[PDB]
Amino acid sequence: TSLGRSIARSMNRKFHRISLGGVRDEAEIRGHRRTYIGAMPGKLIHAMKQVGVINPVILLDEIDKMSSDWRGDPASAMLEVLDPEQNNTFTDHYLDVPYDLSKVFFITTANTLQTIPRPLLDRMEVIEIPGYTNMEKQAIARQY
């Protein structure tokens, strides 16, 4: 997330981070139908609802930790997030018009490359951040 704030300082856009680890429901990622008091959109939609511009730099959290015990994946939903030409076709359940997140710049977080959902292994770039030594840790300590 320091990398994300570095990128967002480079672009001078707005930066935000949302959790995706431990999500079991697609309807957590998507919205819900209008069948109860205070019906709600997805996490992504409300995350855009707190941002004020339609091109911020947005970070995710732990996208290698979704789950779904029923048919279908939220992998196909963030695959819909992936292509900007597919961004204007969201699945949605509270809202219905697919939002324009084409200009929202996308940056992601997954601690383990291997547990990222396999329908999303296409169009990922493995840039492995390794551990740190004694002196590298000392230097970054003493510096910042």
């Binding site: 029923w70 048919r71 279908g72 994946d73 992998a75 196909s76 939903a77 695959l79 819909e80 597919q86 076709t89 969201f90 699945t91 949605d92 219905d96 697919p98 396999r118 329908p119 296409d122």
Partner: protein, 197 residues
């Protein structure tokens, strides 16, 4: 003007495992739609993208049913339903026209996804599918053929019982496009696949 409004012809229409060029009916003048399928081994779960009606989910299910009926004829996996999740992408929401949008086209799409062979292009196919291997006729092949001629795609197969449609259309579209008649989804397993299995 600047940029072409659409993608230029047959540069978007490329032979891929993933892509699928199928005819569509749109009430402001029909189009053709790029269906994208991705089958690497999973568990059997089907997933949908793009504000879809559930009828396309069941049509994909019926396509899975036909692939479960005639597995060994084209190198399909012997038991893939317990090990292959299927995930399709559709660029649009739902057809207001009833029935599947292009049922046998999706059947060919996920069959090519299962056999991992690229689809043939220059052939835009559409139809509506049943559970006994019978491709029941589709109304409104008029705008589908109009879109295919606008797509520059001249080879358009049809269900067998739409053969009487080929006499009630006027000739000026019928001559510009080649039409084959099919009855079995196993027949179009040989008409959109780059190899014969």
């Amino acid at each position: 003007l600047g940029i072409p409004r659409y993608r230029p012809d047959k540069a978007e229409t490329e032979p891929q495992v993933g892509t699928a060029q199928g005819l569509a009916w749109t009430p402001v003048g029909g189009t053709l739609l790029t269906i994208e399928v991705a089958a690497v081994p999973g568990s059997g779960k089907l997933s949908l993208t793009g504000q879809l009606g559930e009828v396309m989910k069941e049509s994909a299910q019926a396509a899975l049913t036909y692939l479960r009926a005639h597995t060994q004829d084209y190198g399909l996996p012997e038991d893939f339903y317990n090990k292959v999740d299927l995930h399709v992408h559709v660029p649009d929401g739902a057809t207001p026209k009833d029935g599947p949008s292009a049922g046998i086209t999706m059947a060919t799409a996920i069959a090519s996804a299962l056999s991992r062979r690229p689809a043939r292009m220059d052939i835009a196919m559409t139809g509506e599918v049943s559970l006994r291997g019978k491709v029941m006729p589709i109304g409104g092949v008029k705008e589908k053929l109009l879109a295919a001629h606008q797509a520059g795609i001249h080879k358009i197969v049809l269900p067998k019982d739409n053969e009487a449609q080929l006499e009630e259309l006027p000739k000026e579209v019928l001559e510009g496009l080649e039409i084959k008649l099919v009855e079995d989804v196993g027949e179009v397993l040989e008409y959109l696949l780059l190899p014969e299995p």
